[PDB]
Amino acid sequence: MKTPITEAIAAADTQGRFLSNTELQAVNGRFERAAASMEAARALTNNAQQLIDGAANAVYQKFPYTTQMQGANFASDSRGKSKCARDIGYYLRIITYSLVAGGTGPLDEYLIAGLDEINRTFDLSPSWYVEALKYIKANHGLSGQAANEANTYIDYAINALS
Amino acid sequence: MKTPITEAIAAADTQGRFLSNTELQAVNGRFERAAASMEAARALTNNAQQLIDGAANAVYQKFPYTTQMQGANFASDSRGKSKCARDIGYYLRIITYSLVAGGTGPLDEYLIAGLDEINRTFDLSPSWYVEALKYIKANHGLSGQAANEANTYIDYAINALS
Amino acid sequence: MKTPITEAIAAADTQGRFLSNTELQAVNGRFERAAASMEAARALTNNAQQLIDGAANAVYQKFPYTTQMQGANFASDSRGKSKCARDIGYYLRIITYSLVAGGTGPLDEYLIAGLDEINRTFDLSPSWYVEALKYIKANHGLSGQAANEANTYIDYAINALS
Amino acid sequence: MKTPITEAIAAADTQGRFLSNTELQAVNGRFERAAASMEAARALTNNAQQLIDGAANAVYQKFPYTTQMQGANFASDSRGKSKCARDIGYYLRIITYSLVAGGTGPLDEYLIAGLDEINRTFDLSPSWYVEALKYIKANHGLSGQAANEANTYIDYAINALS
Amino acid sequence: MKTPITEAIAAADTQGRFLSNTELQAVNGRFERAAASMEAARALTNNAQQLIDGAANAVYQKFPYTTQMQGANFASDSRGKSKCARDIGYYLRIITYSLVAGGTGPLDEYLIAGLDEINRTFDLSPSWYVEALKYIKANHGLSGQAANEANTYIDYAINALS
Amino acid sequence: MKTPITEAIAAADTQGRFLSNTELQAVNGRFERAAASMEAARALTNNAQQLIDGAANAVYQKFPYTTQMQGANFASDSRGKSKCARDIGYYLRIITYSLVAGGTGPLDEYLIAGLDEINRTFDLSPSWYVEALKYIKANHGLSGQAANEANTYIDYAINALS
Amino acid sequence: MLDAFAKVVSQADTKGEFLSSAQLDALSNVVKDGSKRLDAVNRMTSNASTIVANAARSLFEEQPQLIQPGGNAYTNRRMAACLRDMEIILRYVTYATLAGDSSVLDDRCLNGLRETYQALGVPGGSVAAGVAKMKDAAIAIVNDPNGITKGDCSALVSEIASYFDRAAAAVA
Amino acid sequence: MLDAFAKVVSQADTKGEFLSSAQLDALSNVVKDGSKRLDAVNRMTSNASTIVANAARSLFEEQPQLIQPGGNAYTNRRMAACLRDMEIILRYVTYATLAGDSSVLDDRCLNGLRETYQALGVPGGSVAAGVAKMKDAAIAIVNDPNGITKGDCSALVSEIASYFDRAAAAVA
Amino acid sequence: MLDAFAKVVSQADTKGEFLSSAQLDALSNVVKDGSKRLDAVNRMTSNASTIVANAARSLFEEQPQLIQPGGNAYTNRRMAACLRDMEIILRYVTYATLAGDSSVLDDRCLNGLRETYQALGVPGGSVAAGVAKMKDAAIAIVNDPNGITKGDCSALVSEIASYFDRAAAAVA
Amino acid sequence: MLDAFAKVVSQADTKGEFLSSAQLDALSNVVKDGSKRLDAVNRMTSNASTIVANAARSLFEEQPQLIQPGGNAYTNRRMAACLRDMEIILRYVTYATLAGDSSVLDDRCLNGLRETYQALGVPGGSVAAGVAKMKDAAIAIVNDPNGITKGDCSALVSEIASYFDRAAAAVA
Amino acid sequence: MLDAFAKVVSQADTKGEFLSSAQLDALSNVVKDGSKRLDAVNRMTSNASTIVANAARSLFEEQPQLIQPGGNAYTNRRMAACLRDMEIILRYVTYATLAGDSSVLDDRCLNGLRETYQALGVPGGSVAAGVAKMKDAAIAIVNDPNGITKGDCSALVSEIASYFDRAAAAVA
Amino acid sequence: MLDAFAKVVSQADTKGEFLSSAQLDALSNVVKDGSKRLDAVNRMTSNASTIVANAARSLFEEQPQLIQPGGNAYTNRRMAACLRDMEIILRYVTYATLAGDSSVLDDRCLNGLRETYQALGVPGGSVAAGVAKMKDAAIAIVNDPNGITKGDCSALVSEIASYFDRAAAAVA
Numbered sequence A, B, C, D, E, F: 001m002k003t004p005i006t007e008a009i010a011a012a013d014t015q016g017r018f019l020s021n022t023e024l025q026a027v028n029g030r031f032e033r034a035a036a037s038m039e040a041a042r043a044l045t046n047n048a049q050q051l052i053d054g055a056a057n058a059v060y061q062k063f064p065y066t067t068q069m070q071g072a073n074f075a076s077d078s079r080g081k082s083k084c085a086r087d088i089g090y091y092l093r094i095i096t097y098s099l100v101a102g103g104t105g106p107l108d109e110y111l112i113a114g115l116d117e118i119n120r121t122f123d124l125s126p127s128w129y130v131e132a133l134k135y136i137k138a139n140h141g142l143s144g145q146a147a148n149e150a151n152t153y154i155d156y157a158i159n160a161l162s
Numbered sequence G, H, I, J, K, L: 001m002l003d004a005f006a007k008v009v010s011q012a013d014t015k016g017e018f019l020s021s022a023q024l025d026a027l028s029n030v031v032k033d034g035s036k037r038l039d040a041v042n043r044m045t046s047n048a049s050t051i052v053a054n055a056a057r058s059l060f061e062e063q064p065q066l067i068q069p070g071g072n073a074y075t076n077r078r079m080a081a082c083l084r085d086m087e088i089i090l091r092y093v094t095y096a097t098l099a100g101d102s103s104v105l106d107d108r109c110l111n112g113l114r115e116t117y118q119a120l121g122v123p124g125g126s127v128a129a130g131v132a133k134m135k136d137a138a139i140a141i142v143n144d145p146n147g148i149t150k151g152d153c154s155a156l157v158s159e160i161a162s163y164f165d166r167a168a169a170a171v172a
């Protein structure tokens, strides 16, 4: 898995060399940012259920046809509502993984790789998840660099969907 | 030239992507370490001439034949003593470049690349320069993380000679 | 541009050889199929405006929100309905190009290459164009092998959107 | 084995794609041509022994030294005459294979690959076999596109020998 | 042009190194063999016309059909006899080049490269030239290592034709 | 192992050829030189212990610090003197191997490959071994081409240390 | 690879024999039925996206452990690979249908697939269940009598089903 | 490539001199302002998709001949290439912003770009117009006082605007 | 490359227009004359070896400086390359004949050939003479009424001669 | 590979679970003790040449059969390869030390090494003896109280020792 | 690979010893007999085509099943591969003859050949019979007293025969 | 590349002529004088390191601007490239000396070297000065009467000097 530490190791290993002072400074950079990252991860985790429910309702509010139209890809029944809240929880959970890992590794590996193909295949609109992520950004209640960290990874997810 | 910033940019450019939060954290790691690096570079620069003169005398004392044997590679005459002091100043100056740059880029590009060929071709013993570098380490008068930064790059040069 | 003829030559040219009876039979197979292809091309061309306007209207009833929601990607104003009708006309026109050419070359080069990126970037849903293509399939009025030729290229475009 | 159908499959497989309408048209072109191809294959098979003996006699007339000169490569004895009638039967048999397959695959794989090396190594003159093939072209008794098919693969064999 | 010297240089250059004692010994081997090669080249040159006329006659006696059959590839007329004596002269002349150069470089570059294609295209039999070469071998009148040198290059040309 | 013979075979094997006359002359060149090479190898072998002791002493007297300074890389004790005499014996022994084999193969494979890394790692000065080699050159007492052969491989080792 | 014609040719060459009248007759019958064969390939190709997607969706509905966290098809990268395998098998089945011979499917797709799945931990029995779902959908599409000249495609349908069964048997 | 630190180091090595106290002071000030620089890069990176999309939409609104049939940005392949070019230029501008030096933008992006566009037929003047639209949006995002510690970023913003202006001028 | 169909479609896409009824009529006429075209390609291909060899023999008979020692076609390696060039040009002429368009011959064969010949010292004027000889032999083979349904191939023959003439002019 | 953070995250994703407050506390502690970790990596790295050279010298002192003619480390090529192996193992131990996880050392260095040495005839037991000498030297350097803030590095030293012991066990 | 000299050198190095006077004498004998060795290599090389062709012709006359339809040497591609194998073995035998040591023939030709033939279905017993035929013909060519200085090459011929027998035994 | 023998042969083949008796006599003289040529190559090769190092040391003595900071030969990477260039030219001069023809020097070393130096900013006049210093040292080493059979190498020394002068002229 890609993290600031394993990326530094992979770079040194590619060049067949010991870790450089540049890479040790890079890892301390992660160490220095970790306080803000962990604050964001704790808060997103503690309010995960309320954040997931609110994000799902925000999507339905913005795109009411998703609770209207018949179809396997929509949330007009109990099955589709469970699928949607499950998906949004996946986004939130993996964002906290990225905050804790110190990089987008978990997002890239667990969610973004193949994301385009999955949404195309199952007729899932990227705009739905963008709206859900925008809601999480607006309601995580963080400030300072904790909010910066949270918003950086949320924006990364939104970019992956745009 | 390799620096923590250009290494981050080069990594993103090889992958054809925008800079990652991992790479921004890496650059802040350099920014946080810079105060120790700059303190080391200041003390080494301010005492450069004394450090060069003392290091040369330390080599001449450890290896007395270098001041007696005939040959272009030794410092038995004024020409050879000038070459030696020049060389030692090169090491100190480029070490301060690395401290300022935040990595071994200057050492690697200006001195270490081709070092083994030059020492072999001109019959210069690496042990001579190891002794000079050991002198600088014991006489830079630095403490704490400023000493750590200076000794990291001095040890890096010593490893390149070993 | 890829056609059955240019594809046959390309295969022979890669092998550095003269055209074989395999490629001549391939080109004659195009020749035999052309009557059905030409008949479909004419009927889609002569009925284009009504097919285009019917397909756009088909999307609007299936997805009413496309004529109600605010946003550059929707058709709630004259600008967006001109965009949509233009898009559907692009699909129809290039389908007739493919029918005439004997393969998907025109569809592949002019429309499908980069299609996923354009729909993601401009937030256009592929299901919109699928529904439009389904209308054209159900309303071109063709029969026999002319309907086969038309439906094959319509289904090819629907596959590229799925 | 290369045939019009396997070549279409190989082309689609190379691009990792489903078969295209261009390739389906190419295969139907092979299907349409098969009537002439198979009529030629049947006529060549039904008259094989007469064509083989007549062709061998045509070579012996055109190049009388082949029945006079001594050596393993000539047909001055029963062993050499048997080798010659064998080879000519090989050519005829594999031409009917190519007709049945709808392409030069059988000729290419069973006979032409290594042909130059064998004729050089065993001191066999290509002109002998060209004459045998010219006799076959003149006496297969076909007309129309069946004669066209037969002559196309006979000419291909002559080209391989020239 | 490959010679024993240029091949030695090419091996050193390929390895980016100065010439080795192995290459110097290889060149002296050429120098030690040169006396035999020059004796052979002198004798073949001095009797060139007689050798060429006798070799051409040897081919006509071995394959008398070459003076009877009609066709551009045979020698039934003055044009064909001129062509054939020209060709045999080329073989003898380039064999002397190979003797002087100390390797098959001249034969390889001036004659053998493309030989198979030329004899196939113009319907010339390699057996004709093998017979001519066998005559030269039996009639050059050399002894000792001078005969070895000439025979070595004649056999090399015969192998290229076999 | 690289020798003039295995080099010739390797060249022919790279091009999938039989051995050429160039290669056979190369190998005879080695045979002709072998008399000088074997006479040099015998003399060096017969006086090996005297040359090794005299070479060690020659180094100790040119670089007196090597018998006085403390350190595992110096010959100030019996351990270091034994290591040095052992090394010089390795040089002389492998030089006779090269003379016997007719090329630098034994020196390249047994000694020179990795030489720079070993001298750097264990802090051994190449100038020490150059001096020992210069003693051997000055005291082997050979004349004529036998001396030329010995001096060639001694100079080869000297260049590898320079 | 071989098609139906190259298979007979290669067999005859091994015996050094001209094709018999029976073999020429059989191969002419392949040609006579060629248009039906092209419809079958065109119809499966034209519906490939829905054949794969519907079979995958049903597979996951029946086998939820595949898409639970930690399941073999969990994460989008693994889901994309699984959908890709479904499409790959469908692709090579349509190749074999065009060729009238399973060699291309066996040689370029099924050979080694079991060992690949074993090393990765892919549940091949679940792939086989997905393949069977693709089979039934493809057959129903091929045998749809709307928009086609009515006739007998029973032998073709049996042949196509046999290719799907070969794929299932290679991984089950 | 160069950053602000490497540029000073390289100039000093050419002269064989140690860095002066004023040069070390200037580089310490670069470090002091580094947090603001990291925000500028993060904010531009985090909004890259909308910066590119909105600039491109406005460019096509103002220059409709680019997207008419036969136009340079017509067909989805050429539209995707055009959008990619916008994103590429924005990408290297954020690189130069992190480095505090234009070298990476000049060397790896702009050098030879005009000749590439001229050989292709890409209207470089229209690219420049889109780059400037990207500048105004990116700067607005960097300058946003919402959700950031209030301070002076005017020198940083003038620098970033200069990289955009450099990019536009290299193709205009 | 382009064929007659691709030519029309590409120009219509540039104008953003459907094909007109008259353009569709002309393309249907291209198909109708397709059997004649296949015969021309088949007949030139089936006689490629004699077309090349006889033209080359005649060229060297008329220009003996080519084959005398020091001539450009002297040595078997250069003679082989010369024959290969003749076969290459004939090959691309048959390509253009099948396509009904000279683009493949212009783009893949003729473009830059004069420069290449100039640098090597190949006498392009002599190549053009060989090409014209190949043209005469190929036209006679194509236009031979023995063994073919009688009809008018004069337009196709003029087209084929133009491709040969185009090749000769590019190196003359 | 994994670091300490990726290990926890990967295991949690397999169960589909958010990290608990206790897991978050534990990873915060890893960050808190990170400065000590960086010193350990830097001290081993800064002394790599002497750690390798002294351990190898001691190894050959205790096992002279390795360096006598016919021995595995005889000739300078085999000596250099032996020294390289020493350095490779130390390098991957410093990687594992930075990561706080042995996975990079197992995956990219130790797995298959015994079989590689068996095929070559390298005495794995002697490699293990050299590895243990590097361990003792590296640990003494890491634990050296001079020139560093006094503290407790016992858990770190125990971790690093386990990495060296892991390498030795993989070849002994 | 080794020659006669490298063999003695490599064994001496393994023991760390100078070559003895007896070993130097024996290697001087190899050099003294080198002219005869070069003759053997030149004679075998100069007759390679007929050695291969005659041995192959005799093999197929003795084993007609090899060249019947379906036989391993049937078709021209397999016949050429068979002839190539004959030539490769002869080639490597001449290599070993020049070297005075079988190592090049074992390492680069014979090692793994039996298993290669096993996997392909090449009948190695027939290859071995072909090799013996090449041996008899090559020996008679080397032994031919015409056109060479009379002397004793019995040891050389026995060495050469041993290389042929080695090649045959590796595949029989 | 050519040697003395290939140059005459190539000229003869262009004329289609057998070598004359005077041409064979001249090449025989080249062979007779070949031992001196081998001595010259061996002597230059055996002293290559000191020829290069002494010429470079003298060059930097006389042109100290080359090794000042900012000079072309400053830093160890550029110094090593400079020493490499010296060795390369010496290497190719020894090549030309063995071949008795300058073609290998012109074709593989000197052609395009001035343009390379111009693009890089390498002072070609200083390279020429270094080459001249190598010439004098090499010529004196070749002409050393000690330890060699006394004779006349003046023509060979003039030839070697011309190769050095050729190299210097190509960059000066």
Ligand SMILES: *[C@@H](C)[C@H]1/C(=C/c2[nH]c(/C=C3N=C(/C=C4\NC(=O)C(CC)=C4C)C(C)=C\3CCC(=O)O)c(CCC(=O)O)c2C)NC(=O)[C@@H]1C
Residues within 6 Å of the ligand: A021, A024, A025, A028, B033, B144, B145, B148, J032, J033, J034, J035, J036, J037, J038, J039, J040, J042, J142, J143, J144, J145, J148, J149, J150, J151, J152, J153, J156
């Ligand atoms: C056990 C290994 C020894 C030990 C370690 C130790 N260090 C600290 C404090 C610090 N170590 C660093 C080192 C770095 N920070 C970076 O970013 C980098 C990469 C460029 C390095 C190499 C720093 C900055 C500190 C903090 C400042 C300081 O010098 O104190 C401690 C105390 C902190 C803690 O307990 O975690 C310790 C214990 N101390 C010993 O006694 C062992 C010998």
Ligand code: NA
Residues within 6 Å of the ligand: A162, C121, H049
């Ligand atoms: Na994008």
